[PDB]
Amino acid sequence: MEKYNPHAIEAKWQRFWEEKGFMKAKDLPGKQYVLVMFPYPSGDLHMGHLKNYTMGDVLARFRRMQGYEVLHPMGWDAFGLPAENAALKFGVHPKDWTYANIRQAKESLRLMGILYDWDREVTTCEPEYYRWNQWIFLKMWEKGLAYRAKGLVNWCPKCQTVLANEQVVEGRCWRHEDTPVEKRELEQWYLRITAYAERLLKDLEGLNWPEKVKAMQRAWIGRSEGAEILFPVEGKEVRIPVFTTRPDTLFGATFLVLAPEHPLTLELAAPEKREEVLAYVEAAKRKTEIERQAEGREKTGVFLGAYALNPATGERIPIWTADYVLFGYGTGAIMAVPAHDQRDYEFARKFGLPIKKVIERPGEPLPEPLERAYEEPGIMVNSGPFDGTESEEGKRKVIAWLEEKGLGKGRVTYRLRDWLISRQRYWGTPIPMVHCEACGVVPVPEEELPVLLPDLKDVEDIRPKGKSPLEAHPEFYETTCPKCGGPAKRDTDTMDTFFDSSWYYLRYTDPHNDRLPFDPEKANAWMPVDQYIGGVEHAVLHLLYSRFFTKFLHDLGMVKVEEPFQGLFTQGMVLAWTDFGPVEVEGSVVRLPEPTRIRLEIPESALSLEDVRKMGAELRPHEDGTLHLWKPAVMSKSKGNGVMVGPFVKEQGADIARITILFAAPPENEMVWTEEGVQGAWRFLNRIYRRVAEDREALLETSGVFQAEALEGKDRELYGKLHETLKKVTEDLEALRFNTAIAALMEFLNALYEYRKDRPVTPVYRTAIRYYLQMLFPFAPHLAEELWHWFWPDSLFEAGWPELDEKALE
Numbered sequence: 001m002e003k004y005n006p007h008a009i010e011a012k013w014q015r016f017w018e019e020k021g022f023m024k025a026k027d028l029p030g031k032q033y034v035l036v037m038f039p040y041p042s043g044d045l046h047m048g049h050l051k052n053y054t055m056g057d058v059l060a061r062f063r064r065m066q067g068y069e070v071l072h073p074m075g076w077d078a079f080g081l082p083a084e085n086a087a088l089k090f091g092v093h094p095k096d097w098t099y100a101n102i103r104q105a106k107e108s109l110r111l112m113g114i115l116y117d118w119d120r121e122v123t124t125c126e127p128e129y130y131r132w133n134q135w136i137f138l139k140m141w142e143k144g145l146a147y148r149a150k151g152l153v154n155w156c157p158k159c160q161t162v163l164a165n166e167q168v169v170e171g172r173c174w175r176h177e178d179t180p181v182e183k184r185e186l187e188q189w190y191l192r193i194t195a196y197a198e199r200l201l202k203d204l205e206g207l208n209w210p211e212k213v214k215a216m217q218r219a220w221i222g223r224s225e226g227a228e229i230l231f232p233v234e235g236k237e238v239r240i241p242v243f244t245t246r247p248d249t250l251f252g253a254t255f256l257v258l259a260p261e262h263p264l265t266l267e268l269a270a271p272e273k274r275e276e277v278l279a280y281v282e283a284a285k286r287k288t289e290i291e292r293q294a295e296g297r298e299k300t301g302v303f304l305g306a307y308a309l310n311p312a313t314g315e316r317i318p319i320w321t322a323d324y325v326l327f328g329y330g331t332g333a334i335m336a337v338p339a340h341d342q343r344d345y346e347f348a349r350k351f352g353l354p355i356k357k358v359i360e361r362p363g364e365p366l367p368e369p370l371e372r373a374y375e376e377p378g379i380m381v382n383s384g385p386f387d388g389t390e391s392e393e394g395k396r397k398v399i400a401w402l403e404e405k406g407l408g409k410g411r412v413t414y415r416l417r418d419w420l421i422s423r424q425r426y427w428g429t430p431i432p433m434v435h436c437e438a439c440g441v442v443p444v445p446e447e448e449l450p451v452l453l454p455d456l457k458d459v460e461d462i463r464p465k466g467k468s469p470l471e472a473h474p475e476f477y478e479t480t481c482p483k484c485g486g487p488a489k490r491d492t493d494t495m496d497t498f499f500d501s502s503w504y505y506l507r508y509t510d511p512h513n514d515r516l517p518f519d520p521e522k523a524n525a526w527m528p529v530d531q532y533i534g535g536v537e538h539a540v541l542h543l544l545y546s547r548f549f550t551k552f553l554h555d556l557g558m559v560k561v562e563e564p565f566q567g568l569f570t571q572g573m574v575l576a577w578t579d580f581g582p583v584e585v586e587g588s589v590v591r592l593p594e595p596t597r598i599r600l601e602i603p604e605s606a607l608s609l610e611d612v613r614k615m616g617a618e619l620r621p622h623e624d625g626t627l628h629l630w631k632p633a634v635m636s637k638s639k640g641n642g643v644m645v646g647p648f649v650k651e652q653g654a655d656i657a658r659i660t661i662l663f664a665a666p667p668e669n670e671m672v673w674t675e676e677g678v679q680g681a682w683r684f685l686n687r688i689y690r691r692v693a694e695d696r697e698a699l700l701e702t703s704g705v706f707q708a709e710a711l712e713g714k715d716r717e718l719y720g721k722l723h724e725t726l727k728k729v730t731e732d733l734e735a736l737r738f739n740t741a742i743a744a745l746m747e748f749l750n751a752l753y754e755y756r757k758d759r760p761v762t763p764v765y766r767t768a769i770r771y772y773l774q775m776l777f778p779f780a781p782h783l784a785e786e787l788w789h790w791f792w793p794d795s796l797f798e799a800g801w802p803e804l805d806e807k808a809l810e
């Protein structure tokens with residue numbers, strides 16, 4: 001008897017499914033929008049990417065079989081840093097690089113039997129897409145959500161551009177993990193995402209997303225209970241407002257500090273102090289914010305010779321000015337609480353100011369004297385009637401009391417900052433603004449979009465050196481002012497890649513509209529995304545930014561939903577066994593040579609055998625005569641451990657790779673790509689083929705029609721097992737439990753073998769085989785389709801999903 005042979009059959013079915021257009025989505029649709037995170041065309045796709053993309057294909061096929069109108073699209077996140085950094089690293093022009101990579105990625109997807117509605121392809125670096133970036137940008141400008149501001153920004157010296165706060169990961173560039181970001185002062189474009197902070201927080205509650213992602217976004221947004229508190233100045237009319245995120249500490253405010261630039265600094269200075277204060281104010285203004293944000297620097301300040309009354313204690317406190325208080329934040333004035341704020345602690349110690357404890361540490365009380373500030377939550381003490389209150393609650397109680405007594409007011413604030421979107425890079429969407437010497441910043445009219453990127457041909461011209469490459473090109477930026485008609489300069493910064501990806505899932509609903517980003521009728525018919533699949537690395541990047549874009553476009557009236565992704569599933573990383581290099585072992589201790597340690601990215605030069613085990617590593621004898629330390633590491637280019645699709649499917653096959661992926665572990669978990677997994681996939685597919693091949697002749701002479709209620713013995717038993725299997729596989733598919741679905745098919749395959757020991761090929765067996773192939777199709781579609789055609793005329797796409805007999809489960 002012949003054996004399963006994936007060669008030839010896969011190419012045959014791949015072409016068939018595409019020709020037939022089974023995965024073409026209707027312009028207006030039950031619907032299911034199954035979305036996977038579209039890739040940066042920055043390199044070869046490997047099995048890691050293909051775990052994400054096979055997962056979407058499984059669900060898309062399953063839903064399509066059930067009768068849903070299914071939208072399952074693909075496209076290219078082709079602008080900004082990832083495409084351009086990759087092209088530039090290999091001295092290639094971005095456009096050439098991007099389209100070569102797209103061609104390769106398409107083939108990788110096709111060869112795995114993944115099916116998209118390719119009629120909905122988007123390529124974000126094309127003006128047919130980026131013109132709509134520009135349109136959205138103009139609407140944001142119009143609605144008070146896009147602005148230019150001077151201030152401190154994060155700078156990647158390798159990218160040679162500013163980055164958004166979200167693109168800084170443990171102090172490093174999201175793209176250059178070895179490179180600490182630096183601070184610069186620059187005038188840049190921002191999207192006012194903080195205008196949506198409360199909605200972004202509150203609207204997480206209804207969401208079928210992993211709790212870890214919700215927690216990351218909650219922490220990132222970082223809502224806090226704050227207050228403005230008024231301090232009356234002794235002998236004066238003015239009451240100084242201070243902004244505080246610790247209103248619970250008010251009874252411990254022992255002095256006030258005003259920014260040097262605060263109008264009251266010179267206004268309140270005693271006559272004899274004025275000279276000294278003015279000199280200090282002038283010295284401060286000679287510094288940069290960075291310089292005033294510097295630490296380890298001398299603590300400086302001047303006492304103004306003025307006092308304020310603490311509104312809680314009714315006690316007189318001195319008013320100082322000091323460099324460390326910045327004029328542009330809060331009210332430009334602070335209450336200093338040396339017992340609980342370390343900056344104030346060090347200042348008070350230097351200048352001999354009182355330190356007063358008002359938050360007690362739970363467990364062991366704070367010592368006397370206090371040697372450093374106590375900055376964590378505790379129990380209010382020396383705080384009059386608030387004594388004993390847990391301090392976070394006490395914030396709310398002090399705010400209520402302030403408001404009641406006319407002494408201040410609650411002010412809610414957020415850790416979240418506005419989104420720095422402009423980039424000093426060529427390969428990105430031009431910002432649709434003009435700078436006129438007379439009018440200021442003026443928008444490009446909607447009717448002139450796109451503002452086309454100029455076609456720079458020389459890679460060395462494009463290479464970013466600190467300024468936008470477009471600054472070298474007056475043929476692009478020299479223009480006329482739309483407002484007054486005089487000479488003006490186009491903005492020369494471009495939009496970050498995350499602009500593009502914040503609405504692509506809407507473009508897929510209307511991919512060729514040349515009058516709007518999309519028609520709301522079409523978007524609203526397909527939205528929200530029923531199931532989104534992609535990596536947790538986007539938790540506060542794309543998965544936050546997209547929610548902002550959707551709420552904005554909703555507020556413009558263009559989108560009915562306020563949440564773009566109703567379900568989000570974060571897939572764990574595919575890892576590969578990776579050689580980190582030689583080690584030496586003596587007893588229980590493994591010595592790591594420097595190059596081995598550095599590749600592992602760990603501080604230890606010595607690990608115990610137990611440490612090696614616990615990190616998932618092992619020691620393997622090498623030909624070089626040493627033991628090498630091997631460990632699973634995330635599949636990626638940087639580790640040189642990618643399993644690429646072309647070579648693998650040529651040597652083995654697509655269904656083999658699909659089963660390897662899908663069976664390895666729960667999809668939310670990490671998995672290791674292994675030879676054992678590949679062999680297990682072969683064993684299963686071979687066993688399916690063998691069972692059906694063994695019975696092919698008998699199956700051809702058997703009808704599938706029977707009456708379930710007349711079955712007896714093993715026939716009745718098989719019918720029950722069949723429906724148990726169907727229930728389990730269907731529910732697992734709905735839940736993305738893909739590995740246990742496959743386990744259920746493996747177990748039912750065993751049942752089919754066991755059945756055939758006692759029973760011949762019967763009508764019920766034929767129906768079981770039919771149903772088996774239908775249930776197999778989302779997972780191993782090529783084999784399923786191959787065997788289906790041995791007995792039945794049309795595609796598995798046309799066969800439907802089998803109907804569950806609930807009575808069979810009793």
Ligand SMILES: Nc1ncnc2c1ncn2[C@@H]1O[C@H](COP(=O)(O)O)[C@H]2O[B@-]3(OCc4cc(F)ccc43)O[C@H]21
Pocket residue numbers: 243244245246247249259324325326327328329330331332333334335336337339340341375413
């Ligand atoms: N213009 C300014 N320059 C320098 N520092 C300023 C400031 N305005 C306020 N602050 C300080 O930073 C906290 C958060 O404010 P932002 O959210 O950063 O603006 C505020 O709450 B806090 O007030 C009392 C207190 C007690 C404590 F145990 C810890 C902290 C504070 O000090 C204020």
Ligand SMILES: [C][C]([C])[C][C]([N])C(=O)O=[S@]([N])(=O)O[C][C]1O[C](N2[C]=NC3=C([N])N=[C]N=C32)[C]([O])[C]1[O]
Pocket residue numbers: 037038039040041047048049051052077501533534535536537538542571572573574575634635636
């Ligand atoms: C933002 C947007 C939505 C997205 C972007 N574009 C991204 O991210 O792209 S990339 N990077 O290309 O990616 C895509 C996807 O895929 C995945 N992955 C990768 N790698 C891997 C492994 N190794 N495993 C698993 N998975 C994976 C990611 O995550 C995403 O989702």
Ligand SMILES: [Zn+2]
Pocket residue numbers: 156157158159160173174175176179
């Ligand atoms: Zn960088």
Ligand SMILES: [Zn+2]
Pocket residue numbers: 436437438439440442481482483484485486488
């Ligand atoms: Zn003008």
